[PDB]
């Protein structure tokens, strides 16, 4: 459980460069049920859903 609801918009790259955005519906483990901007409900690592606010702004130092 890391914190991903349902109906949450997860931003996801694919290889062609393409970002999309998704919404997360069900969860199990490492594998997210969502559905993609066109409506098809997919099924994606967890590790692949990066949150819409990542902790880009908020990081702690460098």
């Given at each position: 459980?890391?914190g991903?609801?349902?109906?949450?918009?997860?931003?996801?790259?694919?290889?062609?460069?393409?970002?999309?955005?998704?919404?997360?519906?069900?969860?199990?483990?490492?594998?997210?049920?969502?559905?993609?901007?066109?409506?098809?409900?997919?099924?994606?690592?967890?590790?692949?859903?990066?949150?819409?606010?990542?902790?880009?702004?908020?990081?702690?130092?460098?």
């Amino acid at each position: 459980m890391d914190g991903f609801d349902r109906g949450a918009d997860v931003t996801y790259t694919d290889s062609d460069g393409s970002k999309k955005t998704y919404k997360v519906l069900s969860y199990s483990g490492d594998k997210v049920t969502v559905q993609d901007s066109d409506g098809r409900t997919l099924t994606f690592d967890a590790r692949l859903l990066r949150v819409k606010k990542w902790l880009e702004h908020h990081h702690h130092h460098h």
